[PDB]
Ligand binder design. Sequence first.
Ligand code: M7G
Ligand code: MG
Ligand code: MG
Ligand code: MG
Lengths: 259, 62, 173
Amino acid sequence: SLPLLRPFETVSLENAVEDLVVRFILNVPPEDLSTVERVLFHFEEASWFYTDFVKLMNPYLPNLSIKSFSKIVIDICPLIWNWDITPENALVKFSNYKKTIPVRGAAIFNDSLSKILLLRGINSKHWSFPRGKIGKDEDDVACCIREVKEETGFDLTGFIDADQYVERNMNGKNFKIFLVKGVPEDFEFKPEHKNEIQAIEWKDFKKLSKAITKNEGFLVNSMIRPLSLYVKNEKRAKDENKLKLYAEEHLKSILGLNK
Amino acid sequence: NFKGYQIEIELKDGKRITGTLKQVSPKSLTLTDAVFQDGGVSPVFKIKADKLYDLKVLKLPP
Amino acid sequence: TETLEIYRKALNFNVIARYDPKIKQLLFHTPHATVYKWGDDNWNKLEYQGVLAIYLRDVGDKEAILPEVSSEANTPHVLTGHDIYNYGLIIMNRINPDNFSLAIAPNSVLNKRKLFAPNREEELEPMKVEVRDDLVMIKTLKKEVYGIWVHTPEDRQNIYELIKYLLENEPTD
Ligand SMILES: C[n+]1cn([C@@H]2O[C@H](COP(=O)(O)OP(=O)(O)O)[C@@H](O)[C@H]2O)c2nc(N)[nH]c(=O)c21
Ligand SMILES: [Mg+2]
Ligand SMILES: [Mg+2]
Ligand SMILES: [Mg+2]
């Protein structure tokens, strides 16, 4: 209701920082101040906000990589950097730190089950699954839903089976990928965050097996047989149901006093 | 035709009868190894279309 | 020591002061919130997540006016007219650049304004606050129902009582 002035079209990189600092870093609970790795997650959000909106409206403003940005952020507010560690060394700690945070994703399949939904990220060329690193104190299924909505604009809630996942450990990173069936293919899967996902498409399941079996160059190259088995166990069940359905659909009319 | 399909028959009196189908006719339904929710198992059940209420097709044949 | 918090106090002020230039004094700040809004007899998620802050707003001048931002129910109706709104609310949106605002005018000096000077532009509906379903339910001056979420129950019931203490106790100093 109360009307506020947009101070971000024409703004000093100096006052843009002071702003962003209050938005992200400066005003957070001291539990996310425990590690240097903790605080650098805000610096990562703030930098993604800067380059998502601030630099958008301000052509003149620099282009800031987390390196330069976080390094500038301290220059303006030295009272925010408590510890005697350089944000250079602290940021390489953070990058290596990320490499341990376990990913939780999803295997998005349609009712038909012939096709699987896979996404590719901006920098890369490899197709994989909608997936992301867990947050602070959030259950495996909730992190999957948060991360799949952020990546595909789909709230998976309904189809999230908890005991039906695929777990794999690729280079000290735990992947737990849930198996989802019944997703509508017609819906537009646009991602919700800028500069994260390049392309999202429905690759045909059979096509992939045939190309994976050739060994060329995807988490799908390890969870191949589990995924195929799941499909097999699902087509088997969904069709067995349409055989029982027709057996019923004929009984409830060959005798059946259907209403 | 519909032989082997294990079906379940619910009745409005308060009884339920499971068992595998043996003969399908629009006037009569016959079941092999009919188990009743009253504690009765019979190997041969014959019931008419009129004395029937609800139906579900429990299992398909092997 | 505390210099790390005096700065935090000044910077928290001066930054909000650029979105709302009429901040006489900041009341407080809780670092987690999410706006929800009552639509189809249900609560829907809104794109405002970030630090909640209630502040005292300078009110002020005889003819101070509230200007308009440069650009169906989904949108909150902008507050147009004179500056009477004694206190304000802001959620420093970590999502997108625009921030959440609720003008909190006391239900005491609301009727005082609209009946002495019966010149009514908008119909200020005396704001209501309650707590239900882990949400601080806020009925707004323009009939809309906004509910905000804090993780801490102490925080959820502290902002509530204060919001009441503002709309109930008259604005004096
Ligand atoms: C949400 N976010 C993600 N990134 C990009 O996505 C990459 C992965 O970042 P991540 O969020 O830590 O991984 P997750 O998606 O597996 O959880 C980063 O290196 C950035 O390239 C982002 N890049 C920009 N510019 N803006 C954003 O809002 C944004
Ligand atoms: Mg990811
Ligand atoms: Mg992601
Ligand atoms: Mg993440």
